[model samples]
Target chain A: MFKAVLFDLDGVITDTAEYHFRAWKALAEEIGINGVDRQFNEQLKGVSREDSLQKILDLADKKVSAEEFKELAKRKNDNYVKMIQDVSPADVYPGILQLLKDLRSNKIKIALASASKNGPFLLERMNLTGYFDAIADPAEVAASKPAPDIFIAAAHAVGVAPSESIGLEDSQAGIQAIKDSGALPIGVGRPEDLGDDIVIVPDTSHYTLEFLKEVWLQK
Target chain B: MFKAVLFDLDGVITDTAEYHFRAWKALAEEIGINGVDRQFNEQLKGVSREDSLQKILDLADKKVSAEEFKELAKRKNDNYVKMIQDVSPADVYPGILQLLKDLRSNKIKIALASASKNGPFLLERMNLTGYFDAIADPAEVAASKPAPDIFIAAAHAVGVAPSESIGLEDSQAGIQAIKDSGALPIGVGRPEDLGDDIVIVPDTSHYTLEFLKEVWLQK
Candidate 1:
């Protein structure tokens, strides 16, 4: 059986990615980046703010001074922060809260391995802070997802070996990170989106104890 | 004339470096890194905690897995946290409080450009949080000094142009960062230690309004 489960924040737990997309799109339009839609914003998933800004800049074919880039990043974050200010317990995904409770009841440790520096703050805002045994603070890790630093840190923080843990992610980068960390990758999106290696669940609602147990048995 | 004064947290404003040293030393000893001392600790100044651990490991000719390194880093931070629990207003340097007050009176903004993520918490603990108009939260920046990201961010956060600000630092890396940020570098250590390009103050006690006025006039 898995000793711990690490969950990604934005899409797997809640839909803050919508807020991120809105903010990034606003920033892109403000900076004269034409044709920045949801498809382009999807490229930003599971990446750091710096990386996200770089991706947007690349898409726009716009080169900005470091100072200008910093300002734009800050501006985008401010917009996202403003958008998420109204997040409450109601913002949590359908089955995530119950799954967290069941995990705790079974003495299985839960950790958050998010690339966002706002992870802790978002958890606090949603009143889900108590559900986590450990949270990988973005400030603590040198690299974001696709590197496995955050997930490895989270698993270690919760006293769980990577091979004995499961990681839930909604993005391709996040799935790659979990795989690199030696944790079982459970994709929260369509199987086609995450590739054939990942175990797919349509959403948090599909995540159940029996499903997880069956996956663990295969391991 | 300088529109703002940015201060580094540890040796410039106070002596929390001692606590950091002790924590790192303890961690080094635990990891079998013998003969770690104050002189060795000096190399860690203005660097990130992960970098500091890597430096210690390099010194000891030790190479641990990423998981082991993360655990040791967290352990060191835990020790440092315990040591800093008693920090108070009395822990601030002799003339810094007065200098901050004088800067505010002169309508010069004050900001903190510290590499430590603990900067805000330390300031709050010391009852000195209100002394600064802006603080560059370590989590906001992608890199620490000698990269100049934090200082440049601090200057921007305070709404001051880099060339119109003075950066006070006690380490070589910090002096380099200040120079890179296009701020006037005020070295808090020996002149020889920081090189001839920096405006050396010997220590915080020599950091006076008169001294700053002289530097500004020359600029």
Candidate 2:
């Protein structure tokens, strides 16, 4: 049986993706680029902002030298940061608090493995900071998603082997990364993409402590 | 003067931070926890994603049992993979290509000292496949970032001594990782944070071929 539960934050938790999408869309439009719709955001999920921005630059044929790209990225971040300046816990998705409370009540351990460096602040902003045992961010890994480095790092941080763990992801690259790291995956958004052994949930509303017990706790 | 220039892929060449932040943000929010923000991102900038995410979980007070944490982390990764479907070359930073070209023209052995498993993709994306004389990723290291493993791996890849190389990085953790490897750091951001010997730059915008020549190139 599984010993813990990992959660993805976007559509699965805080519902902040709309804001991120809006910010990215604004930036893209400001730069005269097109096609950054829901489909695009969905496609680019689990990618680093650095990589995503570079994609836009490349698409726009504004690929400056690496130095210039850094500057541009910084500018974009400046704008994006401004957009997220006032986010609060209410901004997060519903039912996430319930999930954490359920897990907490059960005394089951929970850890977070993600690529974002902003995890700490967002957690604070959401007032949902007391739900996890540990967190693993990209700064701990040598590479970001699709590389498996981060997941491996997470495994190390939690002091467990990859075989004993499960990775919950919402993106394709993240799934590949977990697979690369030799872990079980519970597919959260699009289940079909996570292979046959995955668990697909439409949103966090579908993820309850009891659901975890039924699917994985009994494993 | 240094005859060779060494680069790190995740932060120096591509911005892997955004991907990581988004992934962590998703997981954090799912559990009704926040606190993974810019400050946290900055702290996590140079480490592995797994470690950073775990740190966030710890901050969230969810500190689950190690075994459970592992399972949860794996689940989070499943979601992250779904998020990154189509990442591309536009992710490369500007001026990095030019820097690589300029350095190669001078016959300087441009080496990569990364702990990323996707180092190859980053090199390919930036069109730096052949530009670098040597590349070392986590596959080549016995340990992760903040350890001397990968840097030592790069040294072995290029047949160079640790002292002969000038390592470049944008994160304080990366700076320390290089320091642990026994190489001089060309600190890309906040050079002062790493002390004077580590070169400083606000960003790539602060650098040029001439500047490199003046600081590291041997006349």
Cα lDDT computed for each candidate against the true fold: 0.85, 0.69
lDDT by residue (B1-219, candidate 2, tens digit) is 556677877657886556766777777887778776644665565555567667887786776777877876786667655554445657767678788888788776788887655567656755678887888867646776677777777876777877777778776667888888777777765432444446677676555667776666542
DockQ of each: 0.01, 0.01
Q: Give the C-alpha lDDT of model 2.
A: 0.69
lDDT of 2 by residue, A1-219 (tens): 555555556545565566667777777887788766654666456667788886776666775678876776677677767766787877867667887888778765566676656676778778777887767776756777778887776676667776667676777677788778877766665433444445667665777667766766554
- Give me the candidate number with maximum lDDT: 1
Summarize candidate 1's per-residue lDDT along B96-203 as a digit string, tens digits: 998888998889989999877788889999888888898898787887778899899999999988889999998878999999999998888654356665578767
Assess the local accuracy of residue B50 in candidate 1 as a C-alpha lDDT between 0 and 100: 88
- Candidate 1: TM-score of chain A is 0.88
Which pairs in model 1 have colliding backbones? none
Worst 10 residues of 2 chain A by lDDT: A189-198
Scoring model 1 with DockQ, what do you get?
0.01
Question: Model 1, which residues run further than 4 Å from truth?
Answer: A1-219, B63-65
Give the CAPRI rating of model 1.
incorrect
